[PDB]
């Protein structure tokens, strides 16, 4: 069936927003860095590798607000062994109602696509924030574009996007503003 169960009573009237992880909220690497926000041990074939994670500027204020405005869902093409621990350390306000990983993506033409149709939500009430356009090729008119982040600590994308989401949380049909 669908990837998500019915929305909880409190989230019924809210628009569902799919939020990507890598290069959107954080940026990670296996290359050691001293200013990492999180260090996550990831076991691969018996070997324990360390992943260094950097948080994107204003990510905390961003997730706290989005959590109040929408039914937030983490959707990533990364493996849970990596993404689940990052989400645990990152989401202190319980913004994420659900989390979907690589297995939930549809591999189509070489790319993992976040097929929003599999969510089980009225697409007129769904938005996706992903740094890679290829992630939503199946639903280009539900997408709220955002630039890929890596380490620019002067970034203000997440902060600057809030007013926009603020007004979208009020519309009845996202297509009315995103054109479709």
């Amino acid at each position: 069936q669908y990837l998500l169960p019915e929305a909880k009573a409190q989230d019924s009237d809210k628009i569902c927003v799919v939020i990507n992880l890598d290069e959107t909220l954080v940026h990670s690497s296996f290359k050691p860095v001293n200013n990492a926000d999180f260090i996550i041990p990831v076991e691969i074939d018996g070997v324990v590798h360390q992943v260094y994670v950097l948080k994107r500027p204003h990510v905390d204020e961003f997730l706290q607000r989005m959590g109040e405005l929408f039914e937030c869902v983490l959707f990533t093409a990364s493996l849970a062994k990596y993404a689940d621990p990052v989400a645990d350390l990152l989401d202190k306000w319980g913004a994420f109602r659900a989390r979907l990983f690589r297995e939930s993506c549809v591999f189509h033409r070489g790319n993992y696509v976040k097929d929003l149709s599999r969510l089980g939500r009225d697409l007129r009430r769904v938005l996706i924030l992903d740094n890679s356009p290829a992630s939503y090729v199946f639903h280009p008119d539900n997408a709220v574009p955002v630039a890929s982040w890596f380490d620019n600590m002067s970034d203000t994308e997440l902060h600057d996007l809030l007013p926009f989401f603020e007004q979208l949380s009020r519309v009845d049909d996202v297509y009315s503003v995103l054109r479709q």
């Binding site: 992880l21 890598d22 990831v42 992943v51 093409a77 062994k81 993992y112 890679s132």
Partner: peptide, 5 residues
Amino acid sequence: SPTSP
């Protein structure tokens, strides 16, 4: 890779 390809 465990991260997003």
